[model samples]
Target: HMAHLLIVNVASHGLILPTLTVVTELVRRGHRVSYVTAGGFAEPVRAAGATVVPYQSEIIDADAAEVFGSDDLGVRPHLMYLRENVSVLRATAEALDGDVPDLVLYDDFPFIAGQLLAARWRRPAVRLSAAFASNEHYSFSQDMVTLAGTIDPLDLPVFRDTLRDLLAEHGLSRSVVDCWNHVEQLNLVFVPKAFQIAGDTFDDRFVFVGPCFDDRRFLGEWTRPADDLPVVLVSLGTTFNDRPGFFRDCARAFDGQPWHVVMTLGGQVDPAALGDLPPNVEAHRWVPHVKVLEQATVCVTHGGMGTLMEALYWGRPLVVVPQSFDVQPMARRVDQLGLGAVLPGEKADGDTLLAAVGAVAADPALLARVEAMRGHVRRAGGAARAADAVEAYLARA
Candidate 1:
């Protein structure tokens, strides 16, 4: 049966890539897919075959200082989700115009609008996590990917109150778990179950679609440098890429070495701000960051889900220096997988970076581990599998 699906995506980079890929496939399958996102996304979403409806996303457009008010990545994101509810609710109201979707899906962040809309329209609500689903054994706090920053106990009530105001009738008032899992109506986690934290803990309602590799060659390219020297790609991702200290140290540590380094500053630091760079190293605001990862021997990253997934997808090992509390969770996975070494952000200096990079490069065991996960990443179904689960959901729902 043909389905009418509404997907609202914030401009989270890692979140949108696979999402649009899945939605694009949905459009190609002839499903009526409507997307609500920012003006910057309207073209790409429309190009992906969805009827793009532009929304002014305050959350997506807001800067970190304005939104979080602090550098803590672990600062209860739901707090911001609460703040976003106002803009998202108002924006989606006029766009929806009482036209209910057959199903509703939304990014894990900024998810309340989809939940509210789903409830109002009497449709099943679904969620897509760029990061895999977490259960008791591998709860958000249990892992070190996003960093060891967990929400303070005192903040829980604030989250609870915010959720109650939004969906008290939907039983959000009953359990705080529902407030999070409600987005999981038919949760689509984009990493393989084998790679998920406590991979076995979650039930069938959470489908691990694994790492979806979008081979679209639209982003600007990076010319592979040199025939020798271990190629290392460094990125702190969008939120945490603002570190001049880390990027500067990276240049200082590896510049004269035999290693060829390509580091992306995102919007944080400018390449010229690094003063003079060595001949072997280059820093930029952007490049085809993934493409650089393809030829890289190892990736130095802040451990954002998308960058880590890309490195694994390309079979490149990692040398992680986490820049945020959230990154520590994924950073620990890098350690557990034996894919690389983790250097604390504060301790990431010339000697430490040199040791971590050299250690991963020299250690055949780490290389094998990276190759092992590469196979897992390959086997994990990308967009098609996600779309299959999604379509199946509509039929069953």
Candidate 2:
């Protein structure tokens, strides 16, 4: 039963990677997909066999200061998402004017247009959660409010007015929050049940497909060190990685040590800015995590879910230094699960980073736990399972 599926995802890599795997799988199974995303991601999405429906993404393409307005850690993303809804709705309408999708698949963020399109077309929409999924028992939003603090009063009215005008222009009167809070009947969460917070609480509507690994050699490949010295991967992912001091500190901490340090600069800092590196340390703008994690003994990351999942997939221990309020819970969860060590962003200096990485890597018990989680991740099913769930939903519909 082949059908056309519309996938709406913003350009963020962490959010898009897991969904990309599913898109590839769905295409492999003969389903036609039209992926709506920013221009930045059109290449990869198109390579996944989907028709690229490019849109001018506010979150990906707009000026950061103009869109977010505030530096408040927790509230910034919400502002961006809120502002993004207006643009996404309009761009999607124009790009997908006469295209009818049998089912709608959308990322958790930039969900406004997805929901609206589903409603207008009278089709089923499946939510794609790259991070945690909210349920009757647990809410990611409430948890974030507790952790990241309240949304700013000033930004709300401004976005609301914009949203109202946008909706009225289309002759729709629903609030944006209506789409934000609506839970789809089927949701795809890109982590295993064992790794999910309150894993047992979610109902049958959610399917934990874990992290999907694919042949992303085009992102570039990494070769392991010829010698037997351990490999340590340091990356802050694609966003919130502006700390050159942190990269410098990592290089200093591992300078004289026997470990091979591979640091990905994430395009925010220049390798030369880190100054002279140790003989064993290497810095690059980007490298495929799958390739690096294959032989990595330890991982130092900003606790982004995609990075954490990739590290766990390879049974490597972690030292998570969360960069934002929303990411702190994931870092703590890594500690709670015994998979890694958490150095709270405020206290994460060079000494702390060195100690935490060394401790996690050397602890046999912690290493054993990571290995066990690796098995769980493998058994949790990856792209195939997610594709199965999507096709199953299509069949039922």
Candidate 3:
């Protein structure tokens, strides 16, 4: 019999889809699957053939704008978020009553909960990374180190110290060094093979299952716009979609332009916030981004790896406006690969957005480079390859 699997995630729309893809595939093979997450994703998880088990956590507040903002206060929220997440998982495990799982799947950042639960239940845990793997030291990290003199490179030191302080504040532990060592080992990153950085040798435990492309397939019955004008998609992604001013600035930037602009504000921003949009601009809470990008001339995004890979695979040029999190690093990579330009989200104005968009949309060389990368991504076999790898790992286990 197949192992009874329990999958845990943060319930971000982006994470649920890819993870569900894997879970659905496993179910097809007759494996018993159970999903552990917040109440928001329960319906979708059940729809994917997994038995939904509600796992409540205090760390996730529906109102928090962006967990990983550049400011110190912004960073603390996520730190506390993760720390409280551990407690939440503990409570969830206690409430289980008797339905213990044989295997656990964890979102990369929430390795703590998965690890703790796995240890408690004596089950195996696997990690599913949301974006690019953090194992490698690439040109992106090198550039950030160079830029650290001006902009503080948010490195391990800051993370370690912050966690230490947070733990102390909660009257939990005084040993910061002990806490750091324990947390790092629990992560197992799920990322795309095409984007994997060279010269970084991780142990066999770090399973590289390529990009989970099956997520986009969940947008059932969603179709792209068939407008005659060239389409340009601008999305800041899920958590940071509250930037209506930025969307408005983009609307102004593309005013009377040749391209038709489609903006997805991610449910956080009201369309009314961006009042009086130009004739060519359409703003909404969500759009089928992958479907739209298939025919897009250019993409203006927050440089999330999943979106970046999709845009690159579609052979379109990008204008990345990195807000926070690892987006800044990914934006730098977009620049390094000649696929696009990086404009800071904090300081980007309509003029800057317009200039970058125009520069990328007009550059044939950049388009050709993106096409070349697209070819490489295509050869990587996308979702099927990742599924095969996951199955192989299970077989070995």
TM-score of each: 0.89, 0.92, 0.80
The 0-to-1 C-alpha lDDT of every candidate, in the order given, reads: 0.74, 0.81, 0.66
TM-score order of candidates, best first?
Answer: 2, 1, 3
Give me the candidate number with maximum lDDT: 2
Clashes of each: 19, 0, 2
The lDDT ranking, best first, is 2, 1, 3
Show pairs that collide, candidate 3.
192-210, 192-211
Q: In model 3, how many backbone clashes occur?
A: 2
Instruction: State how far residue 364 of model 3 sits from its true place (Å).
Output: 3.1
Q: In model 1, which range of ten residues has the least summed lDDT? A: 141-150
* Candidate No. with top TM-score: 2
